[PDB]
């Protein structure tokens with residue numbers, strides 16, 4: 385389609401380019417996963433094969449992982465430090481991917 389308006393995801397706080405609709409990844413059959421952390425925070429997580437503009441913090445941990453076989457690291461916006469989701473590694477098919485918090489991204493035109 386000409387002039388699409390739902391093609392790129394940016395950080396909601398600062399506008400840093402983060403990912404693309406084209407890179408949505410249907411993990412376990414769905415790109416959306418509704419999950420909670422040990423602090424009880426509920427997230428609507430969209431899985432992406434690739435992302436950019438993030439900064440991954442700390443060492444990978446398997447503890448409390450929402451995706452079996454994957455270890456996670458916190459993914460912050462590399463520009464503003466907003467916590468945008470997690471990077472997953474150490475699994476299979478794919479080895480790595482990103483789980484990003486949908487409401488912390490803004491979707492818009494390329």
Ligand SMILES: O=C1C[C@H](NC(=O)c2cc([N+](=O)[O-])ccc2C(=O)O)C(=O)N1
Nearest residue numbers: 420421422447448449450451456458470
């Ligand atoms: O796959 C995953 C990722 C997620 N991780 C977290 O939410 C998390 C866990 C801890 N911690 O001390 O273990 C501290 C901070 C956070 C945070 O990201 O705020 C989770 O629980 N399962």
Ligand SMILES: [Zn+2]
Nearest residue numbers: 395398461464
């Ligand atoms: Zn940001």
